[PDB]
Design a protein around this nucleic acid. Sequence first.
RNA 1: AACAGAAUAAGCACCGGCUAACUUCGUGCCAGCAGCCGCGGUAAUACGAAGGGUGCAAGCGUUAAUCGGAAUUACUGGGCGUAAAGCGCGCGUAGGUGGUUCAGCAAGUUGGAUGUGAAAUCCCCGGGCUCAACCUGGGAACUGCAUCCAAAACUACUGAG
RNA 2: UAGUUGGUGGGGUAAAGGCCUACCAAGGCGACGAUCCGUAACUGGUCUGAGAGGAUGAUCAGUCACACUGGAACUGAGACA
Lengths: 78, 129, 76, 156, 121, 205
Amino acid sequence: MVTIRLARGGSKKRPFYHLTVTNSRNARDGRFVERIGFFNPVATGGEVRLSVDQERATYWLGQGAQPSERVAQLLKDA
Amino acid sequence: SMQDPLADMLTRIRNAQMAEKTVVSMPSSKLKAAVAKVLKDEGYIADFQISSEVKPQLSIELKYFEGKPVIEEVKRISRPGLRQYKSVEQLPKVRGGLGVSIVSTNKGVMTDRAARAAGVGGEVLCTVF
Amino acid sequence: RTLTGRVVSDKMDKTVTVLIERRVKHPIYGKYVKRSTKLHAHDESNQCRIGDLVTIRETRPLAKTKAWTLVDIVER
Amino acid sequence: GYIEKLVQVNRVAKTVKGGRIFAFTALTVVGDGKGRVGFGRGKAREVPAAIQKAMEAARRNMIQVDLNGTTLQYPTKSAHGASKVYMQPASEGTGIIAGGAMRAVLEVAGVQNVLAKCYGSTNPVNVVYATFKGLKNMQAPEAVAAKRGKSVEEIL
Amino acid sequence: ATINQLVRKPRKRMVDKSDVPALQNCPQRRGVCTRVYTTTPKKPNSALRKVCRVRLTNGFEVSSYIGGEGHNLQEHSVVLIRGGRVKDLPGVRYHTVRGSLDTSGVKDRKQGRSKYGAKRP
Amino acid sequence: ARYIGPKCKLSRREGTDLFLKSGARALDSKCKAENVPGQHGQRRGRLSDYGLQLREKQKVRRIYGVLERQFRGYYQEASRRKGSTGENLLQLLECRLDNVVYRMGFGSTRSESRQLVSHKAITVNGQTVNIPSYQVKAGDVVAVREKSKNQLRIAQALELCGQRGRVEWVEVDLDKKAGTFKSAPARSDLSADINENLIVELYSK
RNA sequence: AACAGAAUAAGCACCGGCUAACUUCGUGCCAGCAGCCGCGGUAAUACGAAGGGUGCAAGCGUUAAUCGGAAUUACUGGGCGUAAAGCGCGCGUAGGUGGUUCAGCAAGUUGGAUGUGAAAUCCCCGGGCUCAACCUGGGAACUGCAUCCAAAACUACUGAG
RNA sequence: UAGUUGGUGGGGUAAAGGCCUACCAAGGCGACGAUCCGUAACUGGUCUGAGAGGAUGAUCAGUCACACUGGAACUGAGACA
Ligand SMILES: [Mg+2]
Ligand SMILES: [Mg+2]
Ligand SMILES: [Mg+2]
Ligand SMILES: [Mg+2]
Ligand SMILES: [Mg+2]
Ligand SMILES: [Mg+2]
């Protein structure tokens, strides 16, 4: 299956996720089909937490992309 | 058996301005007769004449603002066997834009200041100061 | 996609051989060399001569080392 | 005028018979800080007297240099002997970056942005000739423009 | 050379080789010693230099040099050699680290002690 | 690592005032700045041509208190920015926080201003800064923390502002002790003894 | 946020020239030094010490290993009368280069469009960690290769002189 | 260099092919460096350089190749694990 899930970038104790669409049998930090947004939990000041783009998420979700548990709510809270 | 005609027109010009001649006469072609038009409009020679019938000549009169001549150096760039082609970005500039450089473009033989205005690259011929 | 070369061989059966010339430039010395190319175009009717000027195109492989075919003979 | 700058000092000799007679030579360039320079070479029998002789010949037979104002006019390349010299004008913040004996010419001329390099044989008494053929043959265009200015400067 | 020759035979850059041929790409090397000579230098000097000959763990049998002012180096004792080309002696291409394994440095020395391996008083 | 030791001795080799001692008592009375330090303080002659450029670089590096690992770091940010690396090298040494505390006049020496930052007594945007490297911007309201407004180190130093004047890119208020860094300095308020064409040339070769 | 108190916390190489920084004391062709020049034979600013001084700092030095400087394999950018370097002289195949007028063509060439050149890295403008390293948003770039459209000066090919 | 290089007929595999076989034919490649010897996993990139270039492929990422040595197939969507 293909799936929409979260990567992990940044230092220790300061994460920064990436909404990628990947084949399911890959690594976390490995290859991907494309990337559509990010998610910053520790965003402070001028930083933006959610930055999903609704165009490609309209495209992939109509072709059987299968989201994760956190991405079940982050697309919902837009 | 001369292999390149246009490096022979420039050689006679450079030599005659050390014998302090005035008139120079070499055989002509439809390219040499267009280069000397460009050197006249930029201004390095007096005039030029295509005056014969079956061996058409080219009679060039030279300038001397001082005892030193007006052309101080000239070299051939696209020597036959190198064939130097340049686009508009990589097109060279001689002496910070005080010499002339002659580039054979899609719209005729013109100088570097003209084709860069029109945005047409081409083939370099020489770098006259 | 369509190439052009000249024939050098008629020895095999339903199989012709072309030479495709090419001017690549040298990567550091700025000069256009000529370097050749020699294919095995699939002939079809055993009717080309040594010294022709023909035209090839690419198909699926027919034998091994023979994937190009013959479009048409241009000139003798 | 007079701003002095020394470059070289040697110990030349001369064999006569008995012993060997020593002598000192010196090379000193003198400029004005605006574009009038002059170099000088003197030989004498001691250091405080050979420098004075080379200073006097510097402020005779001087050169007027037509600088653009702390820079040059255009990239040029001159040579003398087995010594080849390249110079091209630079930006504002970059100082003079050259080797040993082209700094001393290009200080007292008043230029500040020279970006030079010398090839071939490095001879401090002979790279100076390679520099002064370059500077004394500048043009400083007396023209109506630059991108247009090839109808009134070529007749100059 | 013209351009049409360099296409046919391009410019092949010549290569060098290591002035330290033993201890192949490594900064130090240990070895056990065999003989402690005391040889004489070349012509414009006059001295009596002290030279030990070492068999490494590579199997090579190369001479070495011992610095300092006095060495306790009896034979069959391990050392730790390093590079360094002595201009005076012929055939000597290796120094010897003091204070590392067996040579145990020098004594009563107060200038440049990290060289020759001396402590701080 | 700072520099802890004698401080006339640095001013005594380079042969200038250099503004290192605190009070307005006297130059060359605490110091005796007539000679090069050491034993052979009488012999002189012919500073080498490389030694002139190192002498200019070491002068600028001892006014402010940097070390060379930091100083080359400022030199990289000079050559990054657009135009006139000499002026840009100075304006990254002017915007540093231990300089601006000295320019406002909250200390006698520059090394006193380093200690007032280091003990959390200085704020920048209303929040505490204890780093003597903080590059301040145009319009940062440097103020003094209320727990130490009664220190005589700050009160006495404002009478040492009389022999200094205002540098006309700051403004200081002698009641609430809240300076305002107005704008960047120009290349006119800096003294002509420093040279922006010897330090740039030293880092080529 | 509060309490203790200046208390809890500095070395390392070098100083004859290149090369910033120097004089006394031992030693006397001995011991020893060294990146190269080279010092030491009884007054050593070079060996060993002592004062002094200069460089860097929580690090400093040596060794090993690449690229620079090296226009010292030179495309950009060198040479061959005597310094190293023109075959003993011819003829000639593959190959390289082509006098002069038109005409055609568009393979080179120039301009443009589309598809591509993974993300990171480098560069530019910003944004977060008390600053910085670090993390991160947007752009340029990736010099390429391919498919189309146009121009025709020069080279190629073709036709005529 | 003799399944070697093509042709034809038949097999074989998810799929084109000397992949395999039976006869036919005597071809194929090579100084633009085949063949053989010696070494080495390649790439996006890193390190120097003003630039052109020169070395080099640790950590991070893509691809390949192995799982004590040499073979071999089964199971299965997909392994010669
Ligand atoms: Mg203490
Ligand atoms: Mg000593
Ligand atoms: Mg080179
Ligand atoms: Mg012949
Ligand atoms: Mg990328
Ligand atoms: Mg270089």
